[PDB]
Amino acid sequence: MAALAAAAKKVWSARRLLVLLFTPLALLPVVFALPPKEGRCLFVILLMAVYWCTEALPLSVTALLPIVLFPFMGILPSNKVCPQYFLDTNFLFLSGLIMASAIEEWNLHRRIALKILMLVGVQPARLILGMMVTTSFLSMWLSNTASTAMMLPIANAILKSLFGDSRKEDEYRRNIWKGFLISIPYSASIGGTATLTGTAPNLILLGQLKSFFPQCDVVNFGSWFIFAFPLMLLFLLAGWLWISFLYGGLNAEDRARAVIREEYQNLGPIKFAEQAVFILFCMFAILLFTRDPKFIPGWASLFNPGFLSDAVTGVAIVTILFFFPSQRPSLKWWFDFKAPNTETEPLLTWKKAQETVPWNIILLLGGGFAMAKGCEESGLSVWIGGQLHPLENVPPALAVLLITVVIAFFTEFASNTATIIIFLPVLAELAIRLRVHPLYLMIPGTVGCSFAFMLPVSTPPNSIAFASGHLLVKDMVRTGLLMNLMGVLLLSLAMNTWAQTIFQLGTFPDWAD
Amino acid sequence: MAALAAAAKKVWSARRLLVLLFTPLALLPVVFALPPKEGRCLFVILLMAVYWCTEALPLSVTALLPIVLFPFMGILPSNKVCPQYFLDTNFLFLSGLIMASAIEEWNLHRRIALKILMLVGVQPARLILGMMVTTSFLSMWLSNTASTAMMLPIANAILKSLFGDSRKEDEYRRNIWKGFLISIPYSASIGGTATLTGTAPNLILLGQLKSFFPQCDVVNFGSWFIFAFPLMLLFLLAGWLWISFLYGGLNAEDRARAVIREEYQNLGPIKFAEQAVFILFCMFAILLFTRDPKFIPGWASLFNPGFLSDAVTGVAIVTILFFFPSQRPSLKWWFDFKAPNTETEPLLTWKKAQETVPWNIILLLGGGFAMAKGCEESGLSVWIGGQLHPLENVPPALAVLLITVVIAFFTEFASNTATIIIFLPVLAELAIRLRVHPLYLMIPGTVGCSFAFMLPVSTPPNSIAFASGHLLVKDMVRTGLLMNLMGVLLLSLAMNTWAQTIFQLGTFPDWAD
Ligand SMILES: CC(C)CCC[C@@H](C)[C@H]1CC[C@H]2[C@@H]3CC=C4C[C@@H](O)CC[C@]4(C)[C@H]3CC[C@]12C
Ligand SMILES: CC(C)CCC[C@@H](C)[C@H]1CC[C@H]2[C@@H]3CC=C4C[C@@H](O)CC[C@]4(C)[C@H]3CC[C@]12C
Ligand SMILES: CC(C)CCC[C@@H](C)[C@H]1CC[C@H]2[C@@H]3CC=C4C[C@@H](O)CC[C@]4(C)[C@H]3CC[C@]12C
Ligand SMILES: CC(C)CCC[C@@H](C)[C@H]1CC[C@H]2[C@@H]3CC=C4C[C@@H](O)CC[C@]4(C)[C@H]3CC[C@]12C
Ligand SMILES: CC(C)CCC[C@@H](C)[C@H]1CC[C@H]2[C@@H]3CC=C4C[C@@H](O)CC[C@]4(C)[C@H]3CC[C@]12C
Ligand SMILES: CC(C)CCC[C@@H](C)[C@H]1CC[C@H]2[C@@H]3CC=C4C[C@@H](O)CC[C@]4(C)[C@H]3CC[C@]12C
Ligand SMILES: CC(C)CCC[C@@H](C)[C@H]1CC[C@H]2[C@@H]3CC=C4C[C@@H](O)CC[C@]4(C)[C@H]3CC[C@]12C
Ligand SMILES: CC(C)CCC[C@@H](C)[C@H]1CC[C@H]2[C@@H]3CC=C4C[C@@H](O)CC[C@]4(C)[C@H]3CC[C@]12C
Ligand SMILES: CCCCCCCCCCCCCC
Ligand SMILES: CCCCCCCCCCCCCC
Ligand SMILES: CCCCCCCCCCCCCC
Ligand SMILES: CCCCCCCCCCCCCC
Ligand SMILES: CCCCCCCCCCCCCC
Ligand SMILES: CCCCCCCCCCCCCC
Ligand SMILES: O=C(O)CCC(=O)C(=O)O
Ligand SMILES: O=C(O)CCC(=O)C(=O)O
Ligand code: NA
Ligand code: NA
């Protein structure tokens, strides 16, 4: 029956067009079953979810679907849905991306990575720790994909230098290779959750909060950092121990140290541009953290309340990158008339920034925000909350555990951003129905959607690591089961112990009722 | 006194930083003179105008200044100013840019250009006409910069083929060269005004109308086209006659025909992707035109009023480019099990679109819209209208003439988009003060800001043409004086004769009072 296999291959080869054409027909009964506006909004949301999961269209292109569907269906006029795509959360994201582009332009990230690798050591467990701490720190500010793609060649070079009764020794070599190659994407995913700009789903949560709960303002850069950074550190430590036990065995060292010092020296001396970019990045982080950390007064109290935000601070800081000189200025240049008068190069030109900023992710976040606005305005949120009646008796902690497990095992097959975009309105409505703080369910879902460790399709970093060829699918699956379990447990601990104090989750807020 | 010249050169070399640092100090008295909110808004507007004119910052970076300045100054909170950057006008612009990227990806624009050049002829006056008609048609959908940059090499090749008592013949050769090289940017600038998506200032007018006059909806793709296309044709004819008289003398022909047929044949046969892109472009134009042309009922009357717009149609049409196959589909492929199962290439991937869309111009338009919103909300518009009291006795036609002349002679030194962004609120307030329709002053300013012909700095197409080296500054100045005069006269004629019927300019609208 080779004809069946041939037909299956033909169907799989044209899977994108088939899914694209047949998803609206399959979702058509949703419109008929539900009330008109809510049914049409749910149809749009489900269509976009299926398109994102199956990759029938580019993620940015699928994110543009509200623009078409909401006005034709009467859910939302164009002049309303279109500006949801540049809410201030997207400007915070854009400022973070511009700062990351400036950092990568001058190889500051590589210098920091190599310095940390020098500091931690060369011993095998110490080396997996070094790699994990480097990737998690660089994923806090750069994207997970960029951090993984930059750190993988360094790991490959170090492993080649290290490895440049035979069955035993070869087994240990291969296990060390697999451990090094699997510790990078996991640490990138873990570290992306520590900051709002670290990964897109955090900004999805921030932007969709404005639509579902416009009066909520307790989630900002400082509060999210003080909540997630200890959780990120605990999860990174647990993952490092798990990987070192599983794979790491918990003159080669000299060779690895030599290759690390080669790659650090190849960067040359620290340029003035690198120092300026680092100082601007430190100012960026400090001013984002200290604007309104909610436990001590911030510098936003010196201005009009309700006017400033993290986006304004980010844009103001990244504006300096476009005019600050990349060469060391000197007052003698004015006095010396014989010096050349070539115009100085700024720290970042707009050409490089534009060619390095992922505008697709910006449009994806905008599509998520517009879908949240359409769900709120069409009344689909009220209908969803009405449908969540049988779950109103679930204990809140058990509810957190179940939603975290469901989102973690659903993000293993789809993009984290799309997963959180689809699942966040459900979490908000469930929290409203459960007489509990909306953040108490929304934050764990946002954090857990980034807990994608089992499959190459789960996150782009996983695919980049799998492209190396030293990792099997079974290896990532068996590591990711326990990674997901530890992440779920630690997320529940964080949500029940110190998120309560940070976000005032103990009482139902006035803006949620 | 060579020290003075040396110091002047030092100052000019560091002009960007000097302007950037000293403009706020020079504009500081504006805050003190005016009332607080209006003074701060005017300070922001003047700072952005100076930065745009002097190029102290990249245009997109300067467009981000409202994000910083309005919240710190209390003019507008971040959650309000940031979404002004993705009003639906920017999505119409983005759809136009994506369609232009799809057109340029498959060399459809080059095929159309070469076909038109074949059709018009090879005779010198006929050849300047051909060039002008090609560049003006391609500037209607592509950007002026892109059209000029694509059409200049073709003109260079044709001139080289043509030229590949000696003083007389050399004079005629040089004049023909100058005429061909000057007819391209002028025609690109003229043709950019025919459509809303042809050039950014039209979209600036459309977006700022939403802020100044939210209830105005008579300006759309169809109405703007039926207003500007006859005006564009008349101005193109006048410019062609002027250039042919000034420079064109109003076996070389065989050689030029041979090189044109070489460059047409080098494109190969018409691909299926080219045909699909052309059909999608025709659908794009027709559906934009027929949505609500205001003289015959459109297809928007079949849906909810006030929900659809040109942006929705544009996004819906350009969405097809991202999944429609670039190769001819066949039903035999399913039946033939031995055919390869390689996935088909879409007409446009998001990678190419992202690397070809000018996101800087999108951010510039957004900055213009945000500045318009800040001017309206801060009360600066009311103050400006109060300051325009002595001009209330000027006849409306004379007012149109004066504003067109002022804007035309001001855009000769700065970007058209920045010029229209700065001048449009003044035009709206002057129209309000003058008891006349706001469009009667706003449209001529928007059209005339694109009438930049005298200097290389006026428009990027002028700079690209000047980079060839065959054009002198005096040549462009002497051509552009009469080009500007004819443009002003034709714009006044259009505003006083047939714009009145198209836009109902004869009476003060209810949404303006
Ligand atoms: C697109 C894929 C992956 C998901 C499944 C989509 C389709 C098959 C699903 C989604 C929602 C479903 C509908 C949900 C509710 C009802 C109401 C009742 O009359 C039972 C059938 C009916 C009408 C379902 C029919 C099947 C349905 C339309
Ligand atoms: C500018 C940064 C990067 C480096 C300089 C030092 C930092 C730590 C300084 C600069 C400005 C300072 C703020 C200025 C004003 C206030 C308001 C006051 O009621 C509480 C302290 C607070 C909020 C300060 C905190 C510390 C602060 C943020
Ligand atoms: C702050 C106010 C008062 C004065 C500003 C002076 C600025 C414009 C001056 C001071 C020092 C100068 C720099 C000194 C040296 C060089 C190296 C050479 O390649 C020329 C450009 C460059 C990079 C100069 C650019 C202009 C510069 C930055
Ligand atoms: C990696 C593992 C071992 C660490 C996390 C352990 C988990 C299962 C533990 C640690 C902290 C615990 C929570 C601490 C406090 C409360 C509040 C109480 O009123 C109900 C139980 C609840 C909600 C606990 C649920 C279980 C919990 C989340
Ligand atoms: C930046 C360059 C190109 C344009 C000129 C900017 C400066 C020099 C201009 C712009 C607006 C001007 C002010 C406009 C109005 C007044 C009120 C009155 O008291 C006269 C002086 C004063 C206070 C002017 C001082 C000079 C001023 C601040
Ligand atoms: C789809 C396009 C590109 C090609 C097909 C032909 C075009 C010209 C057709 C397709 C749909 C048509 C529209 C369908 C419905 C209406 C409403 C009616 O009250 C007036 C005519 C009007 C507004 C039609 C005008 C012509 C139209 C736009
Ligand atoms: C409309 C519904 C019912 C059926 C859709 C069938 C689609 C998916 C089929 C029909 C024709 C097919 C194409 C036929 C031939 C080729 C050339 C070869 O390189 C394989 C891919 C490609 C480009 C196929 C892609 C898939 C395709 C477009
Ligand atoms: C290239 C040149 C020759 C063509 C344009 C000529 C200009 C100067 C002419 C042609 C049409 C004319 C307008 C036609 C109608 C009116 C309405 C009338 O109540 C006042 C004069 C006014 C407003 C005219 C002003 C001058 C005008 C704009
Ligand atoms: C090709 C991707 C978009 C498909 C949109 C289909 C919309 C169908 C709507 C059906 C329900 C409303 C009928 C009036
Ligand atoms: C009740 C008013 C709206 C009726 C039509 C709703 C469905 C419109 C679907 C349009 C699809 C357009 C795809 C490009
Ligand atoms: C030895 C290093 C000397 C130079 C240190 C300062 C580098 C540039 C810092 C720029 C900071 C800008 C803040 C707005
Ligand atoms: C570097 C570009 C931005 C400069 C902004 C300067 C703002 C100054 C405001 C002064 C008036 C208000 C004082 C309270
Ligand atoms: C009256 C309330 C506001 C007072 C301050 C206004 C000026 C603020 C200027 C901030 C400049 C920031 C540059 C990054
Ligand atoms: C000889 C040419 C045969 C093919 C003509 C059609 C090309 C593709 C047209 C696609 C139109 C899509 C409309 C949504
Ligand atoms: O945004 C990132 O850091 C990349 C990872 C991500 O969000 C995804 O998997 O979609
Ligand atoms: O948008 C264009 O077509 C380019 C020309 C323009 O707008 C400008 O000169 O700024
Ligand atoms: Na990251
Ligand atoms: Na154009």
Swiss-Prot record, chains A, B:
A Gene Ontology cellular-component term: basolateral plasma membrane
GO annotations under biological process? citrate transport; dicarboxylic acid transport; glutathione transmembrane transport; lipid transport; succinate transmembrane transport; transport across blood-brain barrier
Q: Which residues lie on this side of the membrane: Extracellular?
A: 38-55, 104-137, 197-224, 290-304, 415-437
| Tissues expressing this chain | Expression is highest in kidney. Detected in placenta, brain, liver and pancreas.
The record, for InterPro entries, names: SLC13A/DASS
According to UniProt, the reaction catalysed is:
succinate(out) + 3 Na(+)(out) = succinate(in) + 3 Na(+)(in); 2-oxoglutarate(out) + 3 Na(+)(out) = 2-oxoglutarate(in) + 3 Na(+)(in); N-acetyl-L-aspartate(out) + 3 Na(+)(out) = N-acetyl-L-aspartate(in) + 3 Na(+)(in); glutarate(out) + 3 Na(+)(out) = glutarate(in) + 3 Na(+)(in)
**Activity regulation comment:** Li(+) decreases succinate transport in the presence of Na(+).
Assigned keywords, A-Z: Cell membrane, Disease variant, Glycoprotein, Ion transport, Lipid transport, Membrane, Sodium, Sodium transport, Symport, Transmembrane, Transmembrane helix, Transport
Q: Which residues lie on this side of the membrane: Cytoplasmic?
A: 1-16, 77-82, 246-268, 326-354, 376-393, 459-478
Intramembrane region list:
355-375
On pH dependence, the entry says: Optimum pH is 7.5.
Stretches that traverse the bilayer: 17-37, 56-76, 83-103, 138-158, 176-196, 225-245, 269-289, 305-325, 394-414, 438-458, 479-499
- Places the protein is found: Cell membrane
Report the principal subcellular site: membrane
What is its membrane topology?
Multi-pass membrane protein
An annotated Gene Ontology molecular function? glutathione transmembrane transporter activity
Q: Which Pfam families match?
A: Na_sulph_symp (PF00939)
Q: What does the similarity note say?
A: Belongs to the SLC13A/DASS transporter (TC 2.A.47) family. NADC subfamily.
Which disease relates to this protein according to its record?
Leukoencephalopathy, acute reversible, with increased urinary alpha-ketoglutarate: An autosomal recessive disorder characterized by acute, reversible neurological deterioration during febrile illness. Patients exhibit reversible leukoencephalopathy and increased urinary excretion of alpha-ketoglutarate.
State its role: High-affinity sodium-dicarboxylate cotransporter that accepts a range of substrates with 4-6 carbon atoms, such as the citric acid cycle intermediates succinate and alpha-ketoglutarate (2-oxoglutarate), as well as other compounds including N-acetyl-L-aspartate. Transports the dicarboxylate into the cell with a probable stoichiometry of 3 Na(+) for 1 divalent dicarboxylate, rendering the process electrogenic. Can transport citrate in a Na(+)-dependent manner, recognizing the divalent form of citrate rather than the trivalent form which is normally found in blood.
Q: What is this protein called?
A: Na(+)/dicarboxylate cotransporter 3
Q: Say which species the protein is native to.
A: Homo sapiens
